[PDB]
Homo-oligomer: A and B are copies of this chain.
Amino acid sequence: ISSLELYKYSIFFRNYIENVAEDCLKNGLILESAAHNVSEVELARLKVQLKNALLNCIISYRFHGIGYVLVKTKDTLIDLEQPVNIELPIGFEYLDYEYVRDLGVDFDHITYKAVKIHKSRLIIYENFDYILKRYVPCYTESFLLDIYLFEKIYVEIERRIENHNFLFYKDESLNEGMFYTATPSASLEVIKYDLSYLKEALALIKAKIGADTKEPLTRSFNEQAKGLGNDGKGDRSNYYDFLKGVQEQVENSCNLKLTKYFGLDMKFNSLIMLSEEQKVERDIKLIELYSKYNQLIQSSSFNNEELAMLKEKLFSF
């Protein structure tokens, strides 16, 4: 089973690949300059390009196992080989995986099409598996088999739908709604197909898909929500933890060179976005807490030390 052919044929596989990338950058990024000399306008334009490059970078990381983003500066096509000491980026460009040749971590350069580019100009998001000692995608052969069977169910349905029922007529001698014959041994029987096998197969395939991935839309066949809301509790969902880990890895990969070589810092906005009503409810409860604290302080005679100890053992104070 070829992953490229399945990607071409199945929109389900395409959505499974792209949903994580879409959800990671859904709430936006924050870009900041250590020097604090770049105008916010240009910083914001650079950010938009970074989001555009990072989308394809995460997609390539999920499909191939590695992603490449070039940080373009005001330099020539030949100067890309030379390392960067300190510079301000002009933009970001995602590099296609099929046009990139990299010989490993021991080398400090890649070949792009044959333009030689130093690795200090590249943001690299890689999935290295130490048990396999190689870069691997997010899917295995079993997952490909599950998707293939899920698509093959409907191919089998299409192969038989036209003749799900037909007549079997045996006759040796050969408007009204009557079929007449004179042969005494003649027979007429309806031949019918069945779909219970495919229904059971669909149920088992759905169970396997739900067991093989954590993306909520893929498991539930677009029936469930992403579970990235605010429930007033710390018990987050599995998808939240997965997205947080992906965001942390992307942040490490980007800041490993943005800060050292380009003097920039990138951050992901919070996965959970509060609503205006929830924000107001939070302000009211905190104001009530402050009022209660003021009433306690004003109408008590606690020794200062006890007051200090209460201060450290309080979260807000």
Contact = CB atoms under 8 A, between A and B. Distances in A.
A300 B295 CA distance: 8
A37 to B, nearest CB: 22
Nearest to A313: B286
B211 A12 contact: yes
B287 A289 contact: yes
Interface in A201-235: 201-205, 207-208, 210-214, 217, 219, 221-223, 225-230, 232-235
Contacts of A161: 149, 152-153, 156, 197-198, 201
Given A130-B59, A182-B174, A192-B190, A300 B289 contact: no
A192 B197 CA distance: 8
A40 interface: no
Interface string A130-156: 111100000111110110110111111
Given A191-B188, A289-B284, A11 B232 contact: no
Contact of A238 (B142, B219, B226): B226
B188 A193 contact: no
A222 B212 CA distance: 8
Contact of A170 (B145, B186, B197, B316): B186
A94 to B, nearest CB: 7
Q: Which of A4, A60, A141, A195 has the most CB of B within 10 A?
A: A195
A287 B298 contact: no
Given A204-B154, A238-B222, A294-B300, A167 B177 contact: yes
A146 B291 CA distance: 59
A44 to B, nearest CB: 13
Contacts of A217: 214, 238
5 contacts: A26-B244, A48-B252, A172-B183, A207-B221, A283-B289
Contact of A277 (B210, B282, B294): B282
Given A188-B168, A284-B288, A291-B296, A145 B155 contact: yes
